[PDB]
Nucleic acid binder design. Sequence first.
RNA 1: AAGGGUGCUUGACUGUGAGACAUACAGGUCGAACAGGUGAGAAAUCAGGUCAUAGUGAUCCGGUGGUCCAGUAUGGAAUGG
RNA 2: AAAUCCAGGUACGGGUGAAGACACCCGUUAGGCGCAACGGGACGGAAAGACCCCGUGAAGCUUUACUGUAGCUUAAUAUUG
RNA 3: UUGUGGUAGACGAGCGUUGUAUUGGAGUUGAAGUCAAAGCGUGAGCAUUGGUGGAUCCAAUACAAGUGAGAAUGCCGGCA
RNA 4: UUCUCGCAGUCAGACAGUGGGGGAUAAGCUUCAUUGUCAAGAGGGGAAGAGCCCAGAUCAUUAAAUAAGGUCCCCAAAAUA
RNA 5: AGGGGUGAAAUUCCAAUCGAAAUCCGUGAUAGCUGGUUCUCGUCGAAAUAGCUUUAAGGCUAGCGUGAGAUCACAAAUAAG
RNA 6: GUGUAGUGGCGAGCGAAAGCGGAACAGGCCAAACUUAUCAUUAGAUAGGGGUUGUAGGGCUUGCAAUGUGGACUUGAAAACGAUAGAAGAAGCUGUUGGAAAGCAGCGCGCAAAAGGGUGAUAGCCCCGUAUUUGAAAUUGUUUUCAUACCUAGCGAGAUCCCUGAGUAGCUCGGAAAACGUUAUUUUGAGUGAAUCUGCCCAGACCAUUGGGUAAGCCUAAAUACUAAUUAGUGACCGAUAGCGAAACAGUACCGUGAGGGAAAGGUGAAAAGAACCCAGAGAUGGGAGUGAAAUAGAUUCUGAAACCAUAUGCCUACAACGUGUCAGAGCACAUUAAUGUGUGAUGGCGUGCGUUUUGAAGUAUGAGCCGGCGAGUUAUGAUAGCAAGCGUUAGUUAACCAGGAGAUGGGGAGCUGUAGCGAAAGCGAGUUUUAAAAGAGCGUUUGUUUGUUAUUAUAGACCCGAAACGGGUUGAGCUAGUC
RNA 7: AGUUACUAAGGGCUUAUGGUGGAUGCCUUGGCACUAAUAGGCGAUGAAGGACGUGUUAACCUGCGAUAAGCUUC
Lengths: 59, 118, 150
Amino acid sequence: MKVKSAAKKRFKLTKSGQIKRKHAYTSHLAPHKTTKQKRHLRKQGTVSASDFKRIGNLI
Amino acid sequence: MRIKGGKQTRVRRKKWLKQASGSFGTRHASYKVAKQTVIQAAKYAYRDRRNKKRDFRSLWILRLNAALREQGMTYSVFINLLKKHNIEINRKVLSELAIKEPSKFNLIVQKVKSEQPK
Amino acid sequence: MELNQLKSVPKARNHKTKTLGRGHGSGLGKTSGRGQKGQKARKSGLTRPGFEGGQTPLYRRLPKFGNARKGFLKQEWVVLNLNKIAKLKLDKINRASLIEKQVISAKSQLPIKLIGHTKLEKPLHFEVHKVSKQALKAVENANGSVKLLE
RNA sequence: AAGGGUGCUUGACUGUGAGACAUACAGGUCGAACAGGUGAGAAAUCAGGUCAUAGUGAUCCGGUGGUCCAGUAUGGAAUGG
RNA sequence: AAAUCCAGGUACGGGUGAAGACACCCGUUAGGCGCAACGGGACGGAAAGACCCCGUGAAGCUUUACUGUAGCUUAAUAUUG
RNA sequence: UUGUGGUAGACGAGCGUUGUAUUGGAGUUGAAGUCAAAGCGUGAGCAUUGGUGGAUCCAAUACAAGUGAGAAUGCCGGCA
RNA sequence: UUCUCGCAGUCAGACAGUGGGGGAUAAGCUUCAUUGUCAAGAGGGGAAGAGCCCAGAUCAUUAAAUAAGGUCCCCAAAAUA
RNA sequence: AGGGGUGAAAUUCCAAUCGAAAUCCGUGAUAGCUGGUUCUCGUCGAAAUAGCUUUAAGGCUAGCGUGAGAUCACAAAUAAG
RNA sequence: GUGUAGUGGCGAGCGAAAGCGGAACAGGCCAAACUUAUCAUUAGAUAGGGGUUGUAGGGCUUGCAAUGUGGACUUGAAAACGAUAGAAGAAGCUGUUGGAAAGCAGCGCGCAAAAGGGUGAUAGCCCCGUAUUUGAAAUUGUUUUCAUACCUAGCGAGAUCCCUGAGUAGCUCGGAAAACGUUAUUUUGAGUGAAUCUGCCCAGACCAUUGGGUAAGCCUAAAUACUAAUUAGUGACCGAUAGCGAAACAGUACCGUGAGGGAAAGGUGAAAAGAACCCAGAGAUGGGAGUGAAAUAGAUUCUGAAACCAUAUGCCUACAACGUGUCAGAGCACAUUAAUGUGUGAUGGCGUGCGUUUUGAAGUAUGAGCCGGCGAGUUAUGAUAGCAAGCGUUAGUUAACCAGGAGAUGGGGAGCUGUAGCGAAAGCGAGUUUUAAAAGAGCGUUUGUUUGUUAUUAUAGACCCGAAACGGGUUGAGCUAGUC
RNA sequence: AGUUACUAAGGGCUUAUGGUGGAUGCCUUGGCACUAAUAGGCGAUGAAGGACGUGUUAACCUGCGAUAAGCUUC
Ligand SMILES: [Mg+2]
Ligand SMILES: [Mg+2]
Ligand SMILES: [Mg+2]
Ligand SMILES: [Mg+2]
Ligand SMILES: [Mg+2]
Ligand SMILES: [Mg+2]
Ligand SMILES: [Mg+2]
Ligand SMILES: [Mg+2]
Ligand SMILES: [Mg+2]
Ligand SMILES: [Mg+2]
Ligand SMILES: [Mg+2]
Ligand SMILES: [Mg+2]
Ligand SMILES: [Mg+2]
Ligand SMILES: [Mg+2]
Ligand SMILES: [Mg+2]
Ligand SMILES: [Mg+2]
Ligand SMILES: [Mg+2]
Ligand SMILES: [Mg+2]
Ligand SMILES: [Mg+2]
Ligand SMILES: [Mg+2]
Ligand SMILES: [Mg+2]
Ligand SMILES: [Mg+2]
Ligand SMILES: [Mg+2]
Ligand SMILES: [Mg+2]
Ligand SMILES: [Mg+2]
Ligand SMILES: [Mg+2]
Ligand SMILES: [Mg+2]
Ligand SMILES: [Mg+2]
Ligand SMILES: [Mg+2]
Ligand SMILES: [Mg+2]
Ligand SMILES: [Mg+2]
Ligand SMILES: [Mg+2]
Ligand SMILES: [Mg+2]
Ligand SMILES: [Mg+2]
Ligand SMILES: [Mg+2]
Ligand SMILES: [Mg+2]
Ligand SMILES: [Mg+2]
Ligand SMILES: [Mg+2]
Ligand SMILES: [Mg+2]
Ligand SMILES: [Mg+2]
Ligand SMILES: [Mg+2]
Ligand SMILES: [Mg+2]
Ligand SMILES: [Mg+2]
Ligand SMILES: [Mg+2]
Ligand SMILES: [Mg+2]
Ligand SMILES: [Mg+2]
Ligand SMILES: [Mg+2]
Ligand SMILES: [Mg+2]
Ligand SMILES: [Mg+2]
Ligand SMILES: [Mg+2]
Ligand SMILES: [Mg+2]
Ligand SMILES: [Mg+2]
Ligand SMILES: [Mg+2]
Ligand SMILES: [Mg+2]
Ligand SMILES: [Mg+2]
Ligand SMILES: [Mg+2]
Ligand SMILES: [Mg+2]
Ligand SMILES: [Mg+2]
Ligand SMILES: [Mg+2]
Ligand SMILES: [Mg+2]
Ligand SMILES: [Mg+2]
Ligand SMILES: [Mg+2]
Ligand SMILES: [Mg+2]
Ligand SMILES: [Mg+2]
Ligand SMILES: [Mg+2]
Ligand SMILES: [Mg+2]
Ligand SMILES: [Mg+2]
Ligand SMILES: [Mg+2]
Ligand SMILES: [Mg+2]
Ligand SMILES: [Mg+2]
Ligand SMILES: [Mg+2]
Ligand SMILES: [Mg+2]
Ligand SMILES: [Mg+2]
Ligand SMILES: [Mg+2]
Ligand SMILES: [Mg+2]
Ligand SMILES: [Mg+2]
Ligand SMILES: [Mg+2]
Ligand SMILES: [Mg+2]
Ligand SMILES: [Mg+2]
C-alpha cells in the first residue's frame, strides 16, 4: 500500500495518534470574515471522530 | 488437492427421498420434488399436532353434550355444576365413562344434579 | 507431548473462519455479507479510499501544510536521556564507551546530545557535542563533569 | 428605550480565551476572564462594530507587503517557508 | 420428429386476493378413458420490449460546442552566389 | 431466577470430503464401491446385517485445502 | 439507551387510528407529525384478506382456566325474564 | 480491401453478416445494471431516516444492530409530586 | 534505505539517487606529438618504432636499475576427473485357507542391498534390479603440469619547448531521458559556435572561493535472464467432465473460400484356455455343452447410481372437485435392525409449491422438463484490530547471502519498531509552539517488540457469469458492385 | 321394499427383478510443476517442415531413402 500524497502534506500525527490539521477558509476573501473568525481559524485543530477512521487508513 | 464429490451428495439426497416414500409419482422419485414435499409435510405435521389437541377436545365436548341431553341436562350447566361441586374430571374421561360405563357416568350426573355444592 | 497427540494452547490456533459461500446455516450464505444489489455487492469492490460519493473529500477541503526546508532532511541526532542513563552501567560516557555497550553503532558518526532533568546519584563524565543548560546544571550539581566536543 | 440632538473621539483595537448553543463532517453562534496600549466620563462603568436574524464561495494555482526560518560544498543569490 | 414442460389426480357461478383465479371462501354441477372436430381460456408458445424511461452506456451523423490535426497559404532561417 | 419468532447482519460452537505426519487395527475365512431393510443421534450426520463387488481401508490427535450444489433462459452426457 | 474500540446492514417502504398541507372534506392518491402492525411474525376473530381486533410460536401431551369473538344446522358452546 | 473499396445513390454491395466485413490478439476490456453464490446448531437482531453529492437504481458521515471493555449513581428507564 | 526526498488537472497516481549489508571482481588498447622507409613525396597517404594519462601523463636531452612477474593469450606433449554401451553383485523352507501365497503361522538367514518393478492376492531372501567394487577400441567435455609463441616492467636529472580525440563541448528554437508533467545533469531535428594544464567539465538557476574529475576513440570474463531439448529424480500435484486442446493414429475427424475454429473416445481373464460340438433359425444370434475359481467375467468384455422403460406378490381405485400432503381412521395382507411392528388406505378434520426480487408473489411477475457429474470468497505483498506464545526494560527481531538433505537450523545487527516531545523550520528540550508574556491556550510530561491464528482492508482480473463496444494485426472481389 | 361383494378397460402405493445409462470407487506406456547436471542450435558439403517411394507383409503407424524395414567399421 502507498500513502496518499494528498493525505500527507495536510495531516501531521502526534504522540497519541491524533491527526493535526489546518482550518479552512483562510486563503482569500478576508474582508468577508470578522477578526474574531480570522483569529479563531488561524489556530490548528484535529480531525473529528467521524473522520479519524477514514484518515488513519489513508496515512 | 482436487477433492471430488461422491457419496456425499447421494447420501444426503437419498435421506430426503427415503422420507418422501409413498408419494405420487415424481414426488417420490426426483430429489427436488421429494425435498419440497417433505418440508411441506413437516409443516402440515407441526400444524396438525396443535389442531389435534383442539379437535379431540371438541369431539369429547360433543359426545358429552349429547349424553347429557338424553337426561334433560345441558353441557353449559353440567360443567358449572361440576365446578361448584369441586369435582375435577377431564371431558375425555367423562366421555369415556359415558361410552364404556353408563351406570357410573349416570352416578356422577346424579350427584352433580342436586346434592349440596360442597 | 507426543507426535500422535499434539495440542495447541486453547484460543491460540483455531478461530471461527467465516466461510461466505457454504449455505445459510452458517449465516453467511447467498449474499455472503455484501448486502443487496448495490455497489458494495458487486465484484469490483469498495470504491476508493477517502471517497465521499462526489463531495469534495476531507483532504481536498483542507489547506496544505508548508515545508520550509524543501528538499532537505532533518539532521538526525543520537540523544542520551538522563532518566534512563542511570539504569545503564558505565562511567566516563564518551563515544567509544557507547560502542562496546552497543547503544550507538560503530559505523555511525552522528553527534551525541545530552538531554534530561532527572537527578542522578553517582557522578558521570560525559563527552557530548551538545548539552542543555539545565541538564548540565543537574550533572554538575552532582560531582560529574561534561566536556563539549567541537 | 435600542428613538432625536450635541461635545469629544476611532474599541469598525493587538495576543488570547475557561465555558456553552447548534451540528454527520467542513464550517457557524454566544461568551466570562487575563495581559498590552487607548477613547468617553468626576467616577462607577462602557467600548473586541451597528435593536437582532440575510449582505456570501472550500481546496489547488499564482501575485503583493512584512519577516528573528531554510538557502542542495562554503559566501550570497535564485527559489521556497 | 418439433417447439414446450416446477410436481399435478387440471369444472362452473358470486366474492376475495399483487387490484381480471383449474387450485383461496361460500354454493352449483360432474361415472372411468378415448376418437374426430373448432379455437374461448390457460394474462397460450416462439423473441432477457424494438415503443417510454433509467445508465455520469455504445455507435453513426451534424455544426459559428471544446481541444487538436492532415491538407492549403504567409513570413524568418539553411542549402545560397 | 430470567429467558429461547425472525430477514439484512454480528458473534460462538460443531459435522462432513481428500491428502500428509505420528501412533494402533482390519482385509481373498472377502476392503472400497454399490443396492435393500421395520436402526442411532438436537442438527449437519453415524452405524448393523444381507446381496453384488473383487483389493485396499479404518480409529485417534494435529496439519494443508481445487472441502460441502436446487436454482445462474448455467456447461456436458443420458432419458422423458 | 452514556463513553471507547472491531464488524456491519440500511438510504424503493406499506397500511390502520389521530392533527394538517396539495387534491375537489376524491382516490388502495401524494407529502408531513404521532401512536401501532406488517416488513422480519405464525396462532384465534373478521366467510375468504401482509398492515384492522385479541396476542407473541423452545419441543412433546387425544390435560385444565381464559382474551378478542361467539353459542338453530354447516361449526365447539345458553338459558331464563 | 475495411477510420477502405464500389455505388445510373437505397446506408446499395463487399462470401446467406455491413451506420461500416471475417478472424486472431490487448482481453479474464468495463458494467453504480440483471442473474447466481454450495454444511449444521445456538445467542442477539435492524433500517427504508438527516446532510452532502453531475447526486436521485450509487457513495460518504451521522441515526438504528452486534462483539469486547469501562462507568454503580451523581448514568439511563418506570410511577407520584 | 521507503512508499522516504520529491514529482502530480498537487487529482487519480508515479517514485528514485546517495549511504549501508551481500553475490562476483580485471583492467586493457588506439589518435596526437617524436622518429624510420616509401609513394611525379605538392602527402594532407601507406607500412613500422614511441604512447595511453589526473596526488596530470607522454614526447625532447641525459643516467641508474632491470632480465623478471603476470594475462582476458598460439601451438604441441603428458596426466587426472568425467560423458556417450556395459561386468560382478548376499540371503527360505515347511504347514493352513485358497483356483493360485508372496498373505497367515512355525523355525531360520543376508544386508554398504528394507529404492522400485514383475511374478495367478500383501515377497528383504522367486526373478530383474538397487547399495558397493569396477570397466572404453572410437568420439567428446573440464581441469592441471611442462615447453613454446604474442603482450606485459622501476626510481631520478635537466629542459620551460611540443602533444593530449572540433562542426566537438556550449548557446538559441522545438522535442524527449531521468522518480520528475522538461530542468541543474543526459540526448537531438534546425541554426550558430569555443579554449588548450595559469586549460576544460562538474558539486540542481547563476556568480566567486574551495574541492572533485579529465568529454568529444575502442574492447572487456564473473556474478544476471530463460528452457524447446538430453540424463537422473521429486511432488500433503491430476487420475479419463480432471491433467497439455490431444492417455487411442489429435491439431485428427469435422466446420469455413481463407486466415481461423476445433471434439469425443482407456480397463475381459493369472493365462484366449476367445466357446470345438448339439438344438431352433436363412444367418447373425440365442439355449445347452466345454475351458475357467468365477461365463449374471463372452469380445455389448472392472465396478454399474439415478432419471427412464417394462413384469409381478399384497392393498386401494369407475357419483368423483384433488400443491396430492398431514392428523385421526375401519377393513384387508404379512412378520421386523421386537419395535406401543410393517405394506395399502373406505372415510372424517385441515391444507393455494421451491428459489429470486419486492411495501406486498399461490401468482395472470420471474428461473428450473427430469437425473448425474462439473460450477462462484483464492493467492502473493503490505496496514489495522482481536486472541495466544517467545523475549524483556539501554529491549525485541533479522532481510539479502553462506553452509545444511529442494530441511528445522547456525552465521549474517544492513536495518526496522519502541526508548522525548514540540514546532513550517533553524531550533529548544520534560519541555516546546503561539505571543511583549513565563499569563492563557494547543501538544506532551510513557508503556515494548517478533511471530502464529482469525476478521477487515490496499495493489493486482480479486466472489462468479454476461455486454453493445475500442485499438492493433492478418484473411477474404470463386457471391456481389465497378473497371479492363 | 332395505342394507348389500365380487368388475379393473386402465391407474396409484410398497417390495423384488430385468433392460437402456455410465455416475461413484480402484488403476494407468499419459499430463503438470519443478530440482540437480548437460547443452543452448541446424543450413548452399542443401537446413526446419513436407510430398513420394521402399516388405516375402491388406491398410494404417513407425523406420528408412533407388545401397530405401537397411550398408561398412570399431
Ligand atoms: Mg457435486
Ligand atoms: Mg442470517
Ligand atoms: Mg459484511
Ligand atoms: Mg436496493
Ligand atoms: Mg442477486
Ligand atoms: Mg448496499
Ligand atoms: Mg459536484
Ligand atoms: Mg454621537
Ligand atoms: Mg445606535
Ligand atoms: Mg489550477
Ligand atoms: Mg549554497
Ligand atoms: Mg423426443
Ligand atoms: Mg377487490
Ligand atoms: Mg429487458
Ligand atoms: Mg456519456
Ligand atoms: Mg466512456
Ligand atoms: Mg514556405
Ligand atoms: Mg433465535
Ligand atoms: Mg482422513
Ligand atoms: Mg458391501
Ligand atoms: Mg468447489
Ligand atoms: Mg414516510
Ligand atoms: Mg416517500
Ligand atoms: Mg393516514
Ligand atoms: Mg387533507
Ligand atoms: Mg390527507
Ligand atoms: Mg399509498
Ligand atoms: Mg425488504
Ligand atoms: Mg398474523
Ligand atoms: Mg381468519
Ligand atoms: Mg417465545
Ligand atoms: Mg371455560
Ligand atoms: Mg367473553
Ligand atoms: Mg354445535
Ligand atoms: Mg477511432
Ligand atoms: Mg436514409
Ligand atoms: Mg451478404
Ligand atoms: Mg467477464
Ligand atoms: Mg461504464
Ligand atoms: Mg429476539
Ligand atoms: Mg421504520
Ligand atoms: Mg422516519
Ligand atoms: Mg445508480
Ligand atoms: Mg452507516
Ligand atoms: Mg549383471
Ligand atoms: Mg541377486
Ligand atoms: Mg516385492
Ligand atoms: Mg553544463
Ligand atoms: Mg517520462
Ligand atoms: Mg586542473
Ligand atoms: Mg551548488
Ligand atoms: Mg581528454
Ligand atoms: Mg481429456
Ligand atoms: Mg466421460
Ligand atoms: Mg476443409
Ligand atoms: Mg452364455
Ligand atoms: Mg450398456
Ligand atoms: Mg460391466
Ligand atoms: Mg365408488
Ligand atoms: Mg350425486
Ligand atoms: Mg368446493
Ligand atoms: Mg377432501
Ligand atoms: Mg384427507
Ligand atoms: Mg386445496
Ligand atoms: Mg439458495
Ligand atoms: Mg418488481
Ligand atoms: Mg412493484
Ligand atoms: Mg395459478
Ligand atoms: Mg411478463
Ligand atoms: Mg426479472
Ligand atoms: Mg420457464
Ligand atoms: Mg442439473
Ligand atoms: Mg495480530
Ligand atoms: Mg536464519
Ligand atoms: Mg501549559
Ligand atoms: Mg507480549
Ligand atoms: Mg465482376
Ligand atoms: Mg390388463
Ligand atoms: Mg400397478
